[PDB]
């Protein structure tokens, strides 16, 4: 069946929850279910994956989820190639340097603006040395620049400035739409596993999160802080045409999870990142807001997971690349390590370009001020001899 079968499994799970029935009952009713999938987006995601994984190591894997920020509809969903196999778009995965976007949300919510300056040098805290996986430093620079350069050190210091520290980061992530639980994880972003607080590694993307969670949380940002629960079912009709559910008819205001000024300043900091990240601006001069991620393998100089998550006002797409075993250096066929700015960014760009083909280029709202800064700070008579 293909990627199609993974979509069918999510749709089924959603219907079971909607109707409070078991699968045996569902499958004998003769229902016709319209999904949220956009064919054009779905094909673009599938093509992009095949193009960039073609000829690589067969243990390489990817997952792609695209959500409409206007309503939470899942427009494209790629969890793997096998209908009855594993769905990497629901796996608990480390997010590495992409997670620190939530620390930026947390900081802006406490009135710290994009111009706030922080040291980016290496840091040691409780015996652990903290350095930047992507290998950049700026001395001291503003937190917008630190986001673009993926400065984990800066954001670790920023987190420790916040009221609540790592809990502020988890609270912002959860509010954005990172789910509080999923299968295999009863309490996300919790060190004890029971609802207790995270440790400092949250800002380093060390907790497990799903690709669908990242696409959804970034969609909240894309919608100026309005959250919509992600869903796969658009409409359900009975065997003889009675509408039993229709997402179109429901109360489609969302919930204001993040204040608009905060979300719009996050977007402003993220706008340059696609182009900065090895020239992955969207085709045709279309603006975007994006964030790369890489996780470190063990405490080596190798990488394990690589991410690109980014959006326009009309689509938010998260892309992960890793390996099926999850226990080995992430490298291309050339031998080189995979960072978020490489293959996951290739896939994100191709997916988004193909999904948004046939639409005009949108622009982002002008941000208003937070902590004294609105958006990213911008960059004789001669007599001789005597």
């Amino acid at each position: 069946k293909g990627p199609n079968g993974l979509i069918e499994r999510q749709v089924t799970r959603e219907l079971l929850e909607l109707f409070n029935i078991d699968e045996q009952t569902l499958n004998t009713q003769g229902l016709v279910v319209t999904t949220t999938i956009d064919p054009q987006a779905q094909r673009a995601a599938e093509k992009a994956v095949a193009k960039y994984l073609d000829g690589q190591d067969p243990d390489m894997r990817a997952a792609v989820v695209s959500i409409d920020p206007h309503n939470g509809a899942v427009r494209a969903y790629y969890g793997g190639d096998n209908a009855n196999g594993f769905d990497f778009a629901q796996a608990g995965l480390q997010t590495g340097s992409s997670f620190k976007v939530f620390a930026l949300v947390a900081a802006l919510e406490q009135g710290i603006g994009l111009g706030y300056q922080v040291d980016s040098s290496p840091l040691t805290v409780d015996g652990i040395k903290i350095t930047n996986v992507e290998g950049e430093g700026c001395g001291t620079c503003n937190i917008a620049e630190a986001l673009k350069m993926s400065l984990n050190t800066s954001y670790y210091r920023l987190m420790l400035k916040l009221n609540g520290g790592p809990q502020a980061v988890a609270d912002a992530a959860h509010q954005a739409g990172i789910a509080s639980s999923f299968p295999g994880v009863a309490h996300t972003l919790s060190e004890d596993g029971k609802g207790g607080p995270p440790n400092n590694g949250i800002v380093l993307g060390q907790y497990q999160t799903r690709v669908i969670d990242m696409a959804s949380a970034y969609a909240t940002l894309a919608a100026s802080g309005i959250y919509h629960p992600p869903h796969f079912v658009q409409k359900v009709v009975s065997a003889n045409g009675q509408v039993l559910f229709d997402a179109s008819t429901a109360d489609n205001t969302g919930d204001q999870r993040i204040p608009k000024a905060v979300a719009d300043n996050v977007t402003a900091a993220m706008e340059p990142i696609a182009g900065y990240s090895r020239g992955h601006n969207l085709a045709g001069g279309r603006d975007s807001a994006a964030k790369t991620g890489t996780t470190q393998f063990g405490d080596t100089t190798a990488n394990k997971d690589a991410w690109m998550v980014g959006y326009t006002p009309s689509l938010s797409t998260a892309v992960w690349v890793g390996t099926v075993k999850g226990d080995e250096p992430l490298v291309t066929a050339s031998g080189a390590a995979i960072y978020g700015s490489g293959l996951p960014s290739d896939i994100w760009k191709a997916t988004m370009d193909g999904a948004l083909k046939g639409t005009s280029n949108e622009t982002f709202p002008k941000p208003t001020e937070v902590g004294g800064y609105a958006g990213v700070p911008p960059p004789e008579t001669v007599i001789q001899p005597t």
Side-chain angles (χ1 to χ4, degrees), residues 1-132 134-386:
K1 231 164 182 184
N4 299 258
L6 302 175
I7 295 171
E8 290 175 41
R9 275 198 251 161
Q10 292 305 309
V11 167
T12 298
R13 273 183 179 183
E14 186 169 316
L15 296 166
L16 271 30
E17 198 53 16
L18 201 50
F19 293 152
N20 310 128
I21 57 177
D22 64 358
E23 198 173 343
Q24 230 189 44
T25 300
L26 177 64
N27 294 355
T28 69
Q29 300 291 294
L31 302 179
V32 177
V33 182
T34 303
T35 76
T36 50
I37 301 295
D38 173 35
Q40 184 188 321
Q42 182 63 34
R43 231 96 277 126
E46 286 177 15
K47 191 153 79 101
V49 174
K51 172 178 190 187
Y52 299 100
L53 271 55
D54 182 71
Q56 294 298 326
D57 193 325
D59 294 357
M60 191 176 297
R61 295 280 183 287
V64 184
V65 176
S66 301
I67 285 170
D68 188 345
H70 301 298
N71 58 21
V74 171
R75 302 295 186 209
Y77 188 85
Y78 177 89
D81 292 334
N82 299 314
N84 301 132
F86 189 56
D87 188 343
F88 270 102
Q90 299 289 329
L93 299 167
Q94 292 181 313
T95 54
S97 49
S98 64
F99 214 64
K100 60 177 170 271
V101 169
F102 303 117
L104 186 52
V105 173
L108 288 155
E109 285 176 350
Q110 295 185 25
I112 299 168
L114 293 188
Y116 180 66
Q117 301 264 327
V118 64
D119 179 13
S120 73
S121 65
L123 173 72
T124 299
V125 184
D126 304 338
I128 175 158
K129 293 234 193 306
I130 308 300
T131 53
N132 294 322
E134 264 109 332
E136 317 188 61
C138 71
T140 296
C141 62
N142 74 52
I143 63 173
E145 294 304 318
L147 195 75
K148 179 174 68 178
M149 289 180 74
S150 214
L151 307 175
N152 284 351
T153 48
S154 298
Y155 274 84
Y156 197 110
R157 294 184 171 92
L158 186 67
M159 166 193 68
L160 297 180
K161 288 173 203 180
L162 302 187
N163 297 332
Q167 193 64 75
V169 186
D171 290 349
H174 288 145
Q175 284 152 24
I178 299 296
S180 293
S181 64
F182 61 83
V185 183
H187 297 278
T188 60
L189 314 181
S190 166
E191 186 51 23
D192 69 2
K194 302 174 160 51
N199 67 21
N200 290 352
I202 189 168
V203 74
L204 309 178
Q206 285 173 14
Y207 289 90
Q208 288 183 9
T209 301
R210 298 170 297 168
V211 178
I212 181 154
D213 290 314
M214 292 292 280
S216 177
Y218 283 49
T220 297
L221 293 170
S224 285
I226 298 180
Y227 174 67
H228 301 272
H231 62 285
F232 293 84
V233 178
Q234 186 56 34
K235 196 179 179 182
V236 187
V237 306
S238 75
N240 60 26
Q242 176 62 44
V243 177
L244 301 182
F245 172 81
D246 195 340
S248 80
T249 60
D251 177 16
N252 278 66
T253 37
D255 286 276
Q256 190 80 48
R257 284 285 191 84
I258 295 171
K260 170 168 173 70
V262 168
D264 300 343
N265 272 270
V266 177
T267 296
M270 290 172 61
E271 271 180 281
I273 296 181
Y276 178 84
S277 295
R278 292 188 54 217
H280 286 95
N281 268 321
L282 296 183
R286 183 183 303 273
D287 295 349
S288 62
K291 184 76 195 72
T292 55
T294 312
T295 63
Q296 174 192 21
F297 182 72
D299 44 25
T300 76
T301 70
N303 301 342
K304 186 163 65 64
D305 306 85
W307 290 82
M308 176 60 133
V309 186
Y311 58 84
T312 68
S314 293
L315 198 60
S316 174
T317 298
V319 179
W320 170 87
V321 176
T323 73
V324 68
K325 303 215 70 227
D327 70 349
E328 67 201 357
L330 190 64
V331 291
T332 66
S334 79
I338 300 175
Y339 297 81
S341 57
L343 286 200
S345 291
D346 295 327
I347 300 163
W348 175 80
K349 168 166 167 68
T351 295
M352 289 283 266
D353 284 344
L356 307 170
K357 186 175 192 162
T359 70
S360 64
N361 287 349
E362 300 187 281
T363 57
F364 290 113
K366 190 187 174 198
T368 61
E369 182 234 313
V370 174
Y373 300 97
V376 176
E380 274 196 307
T381 307
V382 143
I383 290 161
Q384 50 277 115
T386 65

